[PDB]
Curated annotation (Swiss-Prot):
Location of region: Switch II region: 60-77
Family classification: Belongs to the small GTPase superfamily. Rho family.
Example GO molecular function: GDP binding
Organism listed in the record: Rattus norvegicus (Rat)
Protein name according to UniProt: Transforming protein RhoA
EC number of this enzyme: 3.6.5.2
Motif interval(s): Effector region: 33-41
PROSITE patterns: RHO (PS51420)
SMART domains reported in the protein's UniProt record: RAB, RAS, RHO
Location of the protein in the cell: Cell membrane; Cytoplasm, Cytoskeleton; Cleavage furrow; Cytoplasm, Cell cortex
Amino acid sequence: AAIRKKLVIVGDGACGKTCLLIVFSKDQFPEVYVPTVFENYVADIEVDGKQVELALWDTAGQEDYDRLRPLSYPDTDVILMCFSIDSPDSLENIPEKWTPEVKHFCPNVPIILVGNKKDLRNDEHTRRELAKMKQEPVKPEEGRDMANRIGAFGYMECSAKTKDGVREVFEMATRAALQA
Ligand SMILES: Nc1nc2c(ncn2[C@@H]2O[C@H](COP(=O)(O)OP(=O)(O)OP(O)(O)=S)[C@@H](O)[C@H]2O)c(=O)[nH]1
Ligand SMILES: [Mg+2]
């Protein structure tokens, strides 16, 4: 074959990590049952004339999987640090939980900053439940501003629900890994 790379995905609860993996691998969105950790799919993908076997590692942090997470880190080639466009609190934790942590187990490892649930930017229900507690949905600017802060390979937005922008997340993830 060719190039075999290991991608680990981390982020706050319900920011869409497991869903995202699935849309990318199974090629449609899981509405019925979403597991807590999607098992270990290795997915074929062709990026920049290279054939890659991308191995997807899901994580969690509530609760069992707090303890088990750091075990999925070791041999990582690319990280998907995620947050959700509809939760600015999840963004807050990018520089305060997830970067310091990643950089501890996997320094020198390329990070993609991903904001999921893109579809919920202009969802009216969403805009209102947020304004209640004096918040609005994350802007694309402040996501890219944050990717630059943490020293990320790039920034990508996607909605696994609408399937939009998902492939792009994993090309940028694969490129980031291919970069040796
Ligand atoms: N609108 C919208 N909702 C989403 C999207 N992805 C996930 N969700 C919703 O948010 C909830 C959390 O999904 P999930 O993917 O399991 O979060 P997670 O942080 O990855 O949780 P885990 O399985 O790794 S432990 C689900 O109920 C799902 O309906 C998305 O792209 N758009
Ligand atoms: Mg979680």
